[PDB]
Amino acid sequence: ERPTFYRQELNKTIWEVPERYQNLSPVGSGAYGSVCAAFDTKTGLRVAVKKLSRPFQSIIHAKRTYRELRLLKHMKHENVIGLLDVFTPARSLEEFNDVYLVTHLMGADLNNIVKCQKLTDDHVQFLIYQILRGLKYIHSADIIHRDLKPSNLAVNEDCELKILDFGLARHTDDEMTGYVATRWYRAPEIMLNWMHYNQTVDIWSVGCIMAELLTGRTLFPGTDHIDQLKLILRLVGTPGAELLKKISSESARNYIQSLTQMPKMNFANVFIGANPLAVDLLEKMLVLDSDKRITAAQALAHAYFAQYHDPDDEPVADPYDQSFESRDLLIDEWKSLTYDEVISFVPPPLD
Ligand SMILES: C[S@](=O)c1ccc(-c2nc(-c3ccc(F)cc3)c(-c3ccncc3)[nH]2)cc1
C-alpha cells in the first residue's frame, strides 16, 4: 500500500485520503463518523468512503470496529456488501487512530423502490431471490444478519440487490420502542427474547419483506412489542406445547399462555390474488417455531424461483473465524488487531 494522501476539510471534518479518491462530497454524518461520495480513479467506481469517528474510544467501540472490518473483509458475494478498500493515513501503529472504509456507493434502498407501490410477481421473485442467495452465503459462514429490513437492502435501477448494514455489531436495543420499522421485521423469539435465536430469524425477516413487496403494506406494523406479537399470532397461530417447551423464560411462557389460542390463518385469504407459489413459500418462511422454518438454501430450491435458481450459481462462504468474539482484550489489543487487518487488506480483483 502507502500511496500519497491528501487532506481537506469538508463540513468541518478532516479527510486524509489517498489521491485515487477524487471529488469527495459529504453524503452523511453522525455519531459513527461521516460518509462521503467520491470517485475511485483506480477502479472507476463511485464509492462511499466512511471515516469512523474515534473507533477506539472504549473496549466496546474498538471491538465493534474490529468486528466490522473482519466482517466486511470477509464478505465476497454479489448480493452482499463488500469492502473495496480500507486505509489509515497513519504511518505507524503508534499514530494509528483513524479508520476509513471504502465500498460501492449505494444509491436507493428497497425501502424506496417499494414504499412507492405494490410490485409485480416477477419483481418479487427476483428481489427475494437475491436476498436468499446472499443469505445462503452469509449463513453458510455461520453469520446471522439479525436486522434484515427494507432500509438495509440496496437496490439499483436494474433491480439488483445487496444486503447491507449488518446487525452483527451493535447490541440489539434502544430503538425498538413504539410504532417503529426497526422492529416490524424481527422474529418474535428474538423480539421478546424468548430463546437463543438461530439463523432462521433472518428467514422470518425475508418473509415480512416478501409479504410487503406483494401487498405493498407492512405485514406486522405493531405499535409496540406486545401489539406486534399479537398481530403475529393472529396470522401464524399461538404456540403449541412443543414450541412452548423451547421458550426459556417462565414469565414469557406464562404470558403466552394467558393468550386465547388461535389457529394459523389461511394465507391465500391474506395474500389475495398472489401467485399460489408465493403464498406457499411465505407459509414456509413465517412459521412460529424457528426450528421448523425453511433455510435459505431450501428456499432457493422452491418452485417459486424456478426462473432464477441455478445451484451452480449460489456459492457459499469460506469459513468465518469468530473466535475473537469471545476474546477478552484491552483497547490497545483490539486496536492492534484492527491495525493488522487494515495494514493487510488485499483488494478485490478488477475483471
Ligand atoms: C450507525 S449509523 O446509523 C450509520 C449509518 C450509515 C453508515 C454507512 N456506512 C457506509 C459504508 C461506507 C464504506 C464501507 F466500506 C462500508 C459501509 C454507508 C454507505 C454505503 C454505500 N453507499 C452509501 C453509504 N453508510 C454507517 C453507520
Ligand 1 center to 92 CA (angstroms):
26
Q: Which three cell numbers stand for residue 177?
A: 420502542
DSSP letters along 44-85, please?
--EEEEEEESSTTSSHHHHHHHHHHHHHHHH---TTB---SE
Question: Within 13 Å and on the Cβ side, how many CA atoms surround 41?
Answer: 9
Assess whether 165 carries a catalytic annotation: yes
Q: Are strands 85-87 and 13-18 parallel, antiparallel or unpaired?
A: unpaired
Distance CA 26, CA 10 (A): 7
Ligand 1 atom having least distance to the Cα of 170: 1
**In which residue ranges of the chain is CATH 1.10.510.10 found?**
108-316
Residue having the nearest C-alpha atom to atom 1 of ligand 1: 32
Sign of CA dihedral 84, 86, 89, 91: negative
Whole-number Å distance, alpha carbon 167 to ligand 1 midpoint, is: 13
Residues 87-95: contacts with CB within 8 Å, 24+ apart?
A: 87/1, 87/17, 87/18, 87/342, 87/345, 88/339, 88/342, 89/5, 89/7, 89/16, 89/17, 93/335, 93/336, 93/339
8-state DSSP, 130: H
Task: Please state how this structure was obtained.
Answer: X-ray
- Mutate which of 24, 35, 171 for ligand 1? The one with the most ligand atoms within 8 Å of its CB, which is 35
Residue 185 assigned ligand-binding role: no
Q: Count CB-CB contacts under 10 A for residue 193.
A: 14
* 3-state SS, residue 116: coil
Dist CA 151 CA 167 (whole Å):
12
Contact between 287 and 280 under an 8 Å Cβ cutoff? The reply is no
Work out whether the CA dihedral 44, 126, 106, 75 comes out positive or negative.
negative
Distance of CA 349 to the CA centre of its chain: 24
DSSP codes, 131-198: HHHHHHHHHHTT-------GGGEEE-TT--EEE-S-SSSS-S-SS-SSS-HHHHTS-HHHHTT-S---
CA-to-CA distance for 179 and 228, rounded, in angstroms?
9
Cβ < 6 Å from ligand 1: which residues?
Answer: 30, 32, 35, 48, 50, 72, 83, 101-103, 105-106
d(CA 99, CA 85): 11
In Å, what resolution does this model reach?
2.5
Phi, psi (rounded to 5 degrees) for 290: -60, -25
Q: Which three cell numbers stand for residue 195?
A: 430463546
Give the domain 2-107+317-346 fold: Phosphorylase Kinase; domain 1 (3.30.200)
Residue keyed to cell 480500507: 86
Cα gap 101→49, rounded to integer Å:
6
Residues of the chain with CATH 3.30.200.20: 2-107+317-346
Q: HSE, CB side, 13 Å, CA atoms: give it for residue 277.
A: 13
30 carries a ligand binding annotation: yes
Task: Please give the grid coordinates belonging to residue 2.
Answer: 502507502
Residue type, 101: L
Whether 98 and 86 have beta carbons less than 8 Å apart is answered as no
Number of helices (H), then strands (E), belonging to the chain: the values are: 12, 10
- Are residues 152 and 162 in contact, defined by beta-carbon separation less than 8 angstroms? no
Assess contact for 246 and 302: CB atoms under 8 A.
no
Sheet bearing 153-155, strands edge to edge: 108-109, 153-155, 161-163
Sequence letter at residue 349: P
C-alpha span between 53 and 227 (Å, rounded) = 37
Site of grid cell 395474500: 271
Grid coordinates representing 142 are 455461520
SS3 326: helix
Please identify which residue in the block is written with the cell numbers 391474506: 270
Q: Find the catalytic residue in 165, 224, 280, 289.
A: 165
Calculate the alpha carbon distances from 143 to 50, 210, 264 in Å: 23, 21, 30
**Is 27 a known ligand-binding residue?**
yes
Measured CA to CA, the distance from residue 267 to residue 283 in angstroms comes to 7
Rounded distance between C-alpha atoms, residue 181 and residue 114, angstroms: 14
Domain 108-316, second-level architecture: Orthogonal Bundle (1.10)
Helix (H) or strand (E) holding 225: helix 225-236
Terminal Cα distance for the chain, rounded? 20
Residue at grid coordinates 485520503: 17
